[PDB]
Design a protein around this ligand. Structure first.
Ligand SMILES: [Cl-]
Ligand SMILES: [Cl-]
Ligand SMILES: [Cl-]
Ligand SMILES: [Cl-]
Ligand SMILES: [Fe+3]
Ligand SMILES: [Fe+3]
Ligand SMILES: [Fe+3]
Ligand SMILES: [Fe+3]
Lengths: 381, 381
C-alpha cells in the first residue's frame, strides 16, 4: 500500500518518541533485575507488551523508559519513603544496564542532540523518567542526583498524594492542587532542567503547575476529557493552559482513558484523541504516550510496541499532513526537552539560587566553639 | 631558598593529589549544605582546615573529596541504613554544587585523563570517594549509581562493621575480615572500576582484600604500624601484600596515628612514615592522604591545606629524589586509578556478569499467569 510505504518513510526520516513505557518494571517483576544470560528472553519476552525484537519491528525512534516504583505502602512512613528511594536506584540501575548490554539497539539520550545522534546511528534513543515524587523521599538533593543519573522528566505524582502535589485518583484531596513545597519545587525543576510531567496529577494541580512553570511541560501519558471523562484525562481548560505553556500532551493507549467500556477501545479512538487535541491547540502540542507495560491489554490495533506503523498510517489516512504527523511522532517532545534545557541554562547563567533540603544540626555549640577556637589558633601562626 | 623554589616547581609540573579530605562534611556541619551567598566564607572559612583561598595557597593539584556520612545510630536498623543512603546523595549533591559554583578553582575529574586536563587548566582535580559501605544501604545497584554520580573509591568500612567487612576500631570482630558478601563485592568493585580503599578496615580484612582483588587498591588515609602501633595503621605484612597488589598507601596526617602522645606529632613524623614505606616497598607505592577536616587539629607544620609546599620541601631535604617526590605527590594514585579502570574495561570487555541485589517478588502466580495468557493471545493475532 502507498500509505504503508509513506508511514515507513516517516519513521525512518524522524524518530517516533514515545512518552512512557514501563518495561523496566516488567524486568523487575519477571527477572528481578537480573538479566545475565537472558537475551533470548529480552528479545522474545514470555510476558508484556515490550521486547527488543518487537521494539525494532515497530520502528520506534526513541523512548522515555519509566523508572517507576510503587507508592509506599509501609505503616511506618519514613521506612516506606526511604524504601522507594532505594528501589528507584535499582530501577535506574537496570535501565542503564539494559542499554549498556544492548548497544546495537538502545543508546542513552538526555537531550535533543543526543536523541538525534542516536537516531542517525539507527538506535532507539533511550531516555529516562520517574513516575511520582514519592520516589525522591522528600529530598531535592536526591532529585538533582536522579537528574545527574539521566532522569529527564518527573511525574509530580502517581496514584498517591505526596508532600508536593495531589494525585488524580485519590480522594479526599490533600493540598487542593500543589502545596507550598510543590510551588517552590516547580522553580527548582525549571532551574535544573527537569521536564515537568503532569500525568497522574489532579486537574487543580495541572492548572497551578501550567500557570507557574517558566518552561514547557508534558503529559507523558494522558488523554482527552471531552471525548472520555476520567480524572486522569486533560480538560479543555488545562489543554488551553498547556498551549500558553508551550507544552505537549502525549496521548495514552490506556483503554480505560479512551472508552467507557474498556473492551471497545481501538486504534481509531487514539487517532480521535490526537486529532481533537491537534485541531483545538495545534499539532505542535500533541504527542504519543503509549503507557505500554503500564497495562495488561492494549487497544485493538495497538496491542504492543510493534504496532506504531499502524498509528502513523492511521493518522495519514485521516488527512493529518506529513509535517503534522512528524510533529506528533517526536519533533514536539524534542522541542519541549530543548526548551526545558534552554530555560535551565539561562536561569543557571543568571545565577539563580538552588532549593536546599532541611537538614538536622550535626554539631552543638560546644563543637562549634572548639572549631572557631582552633581556627583562631591557626590564624596566629 | 633553592629547595622552596624546587618544591614550588614540582607542584606546578605534576599534581599533588591528596587521598582524603572531609571538607564536604564541614559544609554540612556549618552551612547545612546551603552555600547560596556564602563565597566570602567558602574562600575564608571561620572553621576547619580547608577553604578555597588556602587550597590555592598550598598548590594542591587534585583532591578526593569525601562524601562521608556517619555510621547509622538509629535503633531501627532499616531506617538508619536507608537514612545513610539519603545523606550520601545529599553529600554528593553539595560536592557537585561546590565544584560547579567555583569552576575557576575546582574541576570535576573521574580518571587519569580528566585529572591531567584539570591540572593543565590550572584547577584542583576534584574526585569523590565514600567513607564506608554502610552508605550504600546493602544495595549493589545503589553502589553502581554512586559510581555513575562520580564516586571513584569506596572505603569498605568506617568505624562500624557492615554486612561486607570489619572495621579496625570496633571489637568484638563480626566477620573476621571479609564476609562472603564482602568477597563477592570485591569482584563487583573490580568489574565496575571502583577503586578499593582499605583505610578504617581491620588487619584481617586488608589481608583478604589484598589477596582477592584483581586491581590495585589504596589506603586513602593510613599510616605505618611499625613506627606507631595502632589498629588504623598498616602492618608490614599488609604493606608487602600491597606491593604484590600494586597498590598505594597514602600517608595520614592524623596525630593519633603518627605518635604515642598526639601533641608531639609533626611534619617530620609524616616524612618518617613516607620514607619508611618508600624504603621497604618502593616510592611508587606511597602517597599523601592528609585526612584534613577529619580531625580538629593537625601535626606541627601541617596545620591546614596551605602547608603542602612544606611537605614537598621536607621530602627533598631528606634526600628523596625529585622523581620519587613526584610519585609520592600524585603519579602513583593516578597510576592506580588508571589500572583500576583498565582492569574494569578488560573484565567488562570479557562479558563478566554483574552482581545483582536480592529483590522481593512483586507478582504472585495469579498475576504471572494473566501475563503469560495475555502474551499468547497476542501471539495468535
Ligand atoms: Cl480548549
Ligand atoms: Cl537529615
Ligand atoms: Cl615489608
Ligand atoms: Cl526490595
Ligand atoms: Fe508507568
Ligand atoms: Fe502510569
Ligand atoms: Fe573522612
Ligand atoms: Fe577517616
Amino acid at each position: 500500500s502507498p500509505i504503508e510505504e509513506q508511514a515507513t518513510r516517516l519513521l525512518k526520516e524522524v524518530p517516533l518518541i514515545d512518552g512512557h513505557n514501563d518495561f523496566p518494571y516488567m524486568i523487575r517483576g519477571w527477572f528481578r533485575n537480573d538479566i545475565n544470560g537472558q537475551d533470548a528472553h529480552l528479545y522474545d519476552m514470555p510476558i508484556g507488551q515490550t521486547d527488543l525484537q518487537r521494539l525494532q519491528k515497530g520502528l520506534l525512534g526513541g523512548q522515555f523508559w519509566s523508572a517507576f516504583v510503587p507508592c509506599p505502602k509501609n505503616p511506618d512512613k519514613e521506612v516506606g519513603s526511604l524504601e522507594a528511594l532505594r528501589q528507584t536506584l535499582q530501577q535506574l540501575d537496570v535501565i542503564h544496564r539494559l542499554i549498556e548490554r544492548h548497544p546495537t539497539i538502545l543508546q542513552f539520550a538526555d537531550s535533543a542532540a543526543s536523541i538525534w545522534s542516536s537516531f542517525r546511528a539507527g538506535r532507539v534513543a533511550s531516555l529516562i523518567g520517574i513516575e511520582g515524587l514519592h520516589q525522591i523521599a522528600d529530598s531535592v538533593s536526591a532529585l538533582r542526583m536522579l537528574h545527574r543519573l539521566g532522569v529527564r522528566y518527573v511525574t509530580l505524582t502517581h496514584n498517591c498524594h505526596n508532600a508536593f502535589a495531589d494525585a488524580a485518583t485519590v480522594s479526599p484531596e490533600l493540598h487542593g492542587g500543589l502545596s507550598r513545597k510543590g510551588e517552590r519545587l516547580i522553580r527548582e525543576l525549571n532551574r535544573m532542567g527537569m521536564m515537568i510531567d503532569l500525568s497522574h496529577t489532579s486537574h487543580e494541580a495541572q492548572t497551578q503547575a501550567l500557570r507557574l512553570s517558566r518552561a514547557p511541560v508534558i503529559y507523558s501519558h494522558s488523554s482527552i476529557y471531552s471525548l472520555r471523562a476520567h480524572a486522569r484525562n486533560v480538560t479543555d481548560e488545562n489543554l488551553h493552559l498547556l498551549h500558553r505553556n508551550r507544552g505537549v500532551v502525549m496521548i495514552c493507549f490506556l483503554r480505560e482513558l479512551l472508552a467507557s467500556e474498556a473492551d471497545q477501545a481501538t486504534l481509531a479512538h487514539v487517532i480521535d484523541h490526537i486529532i481533537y487535541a491537534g485541531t483545538r491547540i495545534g499539532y505542535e502540542h500533541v504527542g504519543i504516550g503509549s503507557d505500554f507495560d503500564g497495562m495488561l491489554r492494549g487497544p485493538d490495533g495497538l496491542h504492543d510496541v510493534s504496532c506504531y506503523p499502524a498509528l502513523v498510517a492511521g493518522l495519514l489516512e485521516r488527512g493529518v499532513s506529513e509535517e503534522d504527523v512528524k510533529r506528533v511522532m517526536g519533533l514536539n517532545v524534542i522541542r519541549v526537552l530543548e526548551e526545558v534545557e534552554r530555560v535551565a541554562a539561562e536561569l543557571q547563567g543568571a545565577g539563580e539560587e538552588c532549593l536546599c533540603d532541611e537538614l538536622d544540626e550535626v554539631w552543638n555549640e560546644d563543637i562549634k566553639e572548639q572549631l572557631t577556637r582552633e581556627r583562631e589558633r591557626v590564624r596566629k601562626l
